[PDB]
Tab-separated table of C-alpha atoms in Angstrom:
chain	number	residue	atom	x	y	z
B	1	UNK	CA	0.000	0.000	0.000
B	2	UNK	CA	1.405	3.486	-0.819
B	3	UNK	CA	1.294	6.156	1.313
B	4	UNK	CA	1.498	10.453	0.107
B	5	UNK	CA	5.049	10.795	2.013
B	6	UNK	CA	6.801	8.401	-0.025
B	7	UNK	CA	6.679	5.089	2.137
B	8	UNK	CA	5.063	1.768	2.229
B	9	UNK	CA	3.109	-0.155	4.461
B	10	UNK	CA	3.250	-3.728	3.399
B	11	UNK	CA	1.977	-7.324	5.258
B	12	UNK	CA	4.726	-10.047	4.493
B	13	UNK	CA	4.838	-13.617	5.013
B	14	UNK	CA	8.056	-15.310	4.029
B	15	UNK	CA	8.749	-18.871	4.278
B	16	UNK	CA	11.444	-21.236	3.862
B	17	UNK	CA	10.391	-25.330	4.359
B	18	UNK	CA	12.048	-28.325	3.743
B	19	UNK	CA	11.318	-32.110	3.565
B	20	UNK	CA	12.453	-33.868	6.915
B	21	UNK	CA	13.266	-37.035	8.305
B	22	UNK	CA	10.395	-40.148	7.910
B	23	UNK	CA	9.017	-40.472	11.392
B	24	UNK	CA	6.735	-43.514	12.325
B	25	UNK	CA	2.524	-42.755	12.930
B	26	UNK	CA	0.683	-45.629	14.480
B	27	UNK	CA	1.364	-49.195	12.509
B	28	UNK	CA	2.601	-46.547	9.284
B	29	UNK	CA	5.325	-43.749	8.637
B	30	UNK	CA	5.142	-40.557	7.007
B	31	UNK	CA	7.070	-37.248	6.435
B	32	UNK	CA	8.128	-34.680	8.602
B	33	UNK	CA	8.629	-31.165	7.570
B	34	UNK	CA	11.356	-28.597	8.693
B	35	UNK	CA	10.002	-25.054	8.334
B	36	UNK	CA	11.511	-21.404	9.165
B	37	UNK	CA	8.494	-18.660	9.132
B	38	UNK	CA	7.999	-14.876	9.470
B	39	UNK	CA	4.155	-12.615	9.141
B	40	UNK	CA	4.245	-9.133	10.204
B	41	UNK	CA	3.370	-5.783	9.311
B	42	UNK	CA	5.793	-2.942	8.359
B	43	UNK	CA	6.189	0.328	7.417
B	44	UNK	CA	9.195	1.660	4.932
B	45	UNK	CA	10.404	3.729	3.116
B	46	UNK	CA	10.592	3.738	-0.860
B	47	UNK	CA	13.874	2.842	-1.723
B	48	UNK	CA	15.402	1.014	1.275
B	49	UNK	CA	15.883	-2.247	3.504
B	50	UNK	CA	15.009	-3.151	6.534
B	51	UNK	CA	15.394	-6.578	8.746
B	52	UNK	CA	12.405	-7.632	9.211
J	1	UNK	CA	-8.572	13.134	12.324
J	2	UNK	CA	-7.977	9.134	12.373
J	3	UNK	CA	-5.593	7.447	9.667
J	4	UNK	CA	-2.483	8.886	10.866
J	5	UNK	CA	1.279	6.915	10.514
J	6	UNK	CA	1.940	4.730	13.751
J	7	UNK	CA	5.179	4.104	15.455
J	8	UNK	CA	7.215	0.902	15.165
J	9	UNK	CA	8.553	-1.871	17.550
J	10	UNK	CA	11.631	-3.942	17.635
J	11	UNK	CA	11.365	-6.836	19.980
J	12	UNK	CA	14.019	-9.386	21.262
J	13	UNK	CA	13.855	-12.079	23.223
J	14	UNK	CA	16.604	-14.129	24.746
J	15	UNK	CA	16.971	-17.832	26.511
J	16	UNK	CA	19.822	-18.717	28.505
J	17	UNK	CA	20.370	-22.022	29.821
J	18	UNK	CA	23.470	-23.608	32.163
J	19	UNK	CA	24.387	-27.259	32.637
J	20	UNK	CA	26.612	-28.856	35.528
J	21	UNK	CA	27.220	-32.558	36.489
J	22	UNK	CA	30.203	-35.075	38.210
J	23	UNK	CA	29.893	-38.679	39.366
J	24	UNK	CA	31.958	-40.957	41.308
J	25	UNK	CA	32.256	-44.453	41.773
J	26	UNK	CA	34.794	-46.922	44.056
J	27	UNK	CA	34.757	-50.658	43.845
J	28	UNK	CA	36.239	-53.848	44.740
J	29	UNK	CA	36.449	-57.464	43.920
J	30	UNK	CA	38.467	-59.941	46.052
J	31	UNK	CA	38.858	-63.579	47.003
J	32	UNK	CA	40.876	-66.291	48.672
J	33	UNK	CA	41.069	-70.236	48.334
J	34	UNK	CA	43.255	-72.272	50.530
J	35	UNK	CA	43.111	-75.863	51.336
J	36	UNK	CA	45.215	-77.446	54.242
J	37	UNK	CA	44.724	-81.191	54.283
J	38	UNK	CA	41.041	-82.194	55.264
J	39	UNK	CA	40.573	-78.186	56.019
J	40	UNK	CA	39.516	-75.560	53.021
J	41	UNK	CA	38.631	-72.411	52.972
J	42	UNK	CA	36.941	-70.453	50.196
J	43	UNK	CA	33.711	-68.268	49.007
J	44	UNK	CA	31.494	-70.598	48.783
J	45	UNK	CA	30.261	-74.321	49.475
J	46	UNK	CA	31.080	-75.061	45.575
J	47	UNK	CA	34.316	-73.615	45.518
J	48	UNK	CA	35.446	-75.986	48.940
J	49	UNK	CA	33.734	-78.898	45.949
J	50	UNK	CA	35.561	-77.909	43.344
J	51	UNK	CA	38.973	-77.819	45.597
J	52	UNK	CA	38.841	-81.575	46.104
């Protein structure tokens, strides 16, 4: 979303998953996932980073 | 009067934790076996059995 004094206001999610290991469920198996997550809201301006 | 920019947060948390352990252990295994001529001594009644 822009804003009149040259900024942003912007809701992020950003996500980075794998595939894990094969753990065992009741008499079966199945997969196990390894994740690394991040949802907020910021505000910034135009032309510059920030650590979110 | 209402949609006016709002201030921002940075938050950190942080978890410490300490670990401390020692053991000890002291132990001994002996025995004797001695016979004399219609006399034994040993560490148990097989042992005067098995001396003969």
């Amino acid at each position: 979303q822009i804003t009149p004094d040259n900024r942003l206001v912007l809701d992020l999610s950003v996500t980075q998953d794998r595939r894990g290991e094969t753990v065992k469920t009741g008499t079966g198996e199945a997969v196990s996932i390894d994740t690394q997550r991040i949802g907020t809201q910021v505000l910034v301006n135009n032309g510059e980073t920030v650590v979110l | 009067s209402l949609d006016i920019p709002v201030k921002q947060v940075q938050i950190e948390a942080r978890i410490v934790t300490v670990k401390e352990g020692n053991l000890e252990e002291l132990g001994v295994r002996w025995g004797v076996m001695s016979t004399n001529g219609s006399h034994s001594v040993g560490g148990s009644i097989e042992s005067n059995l098995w001396q003969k």
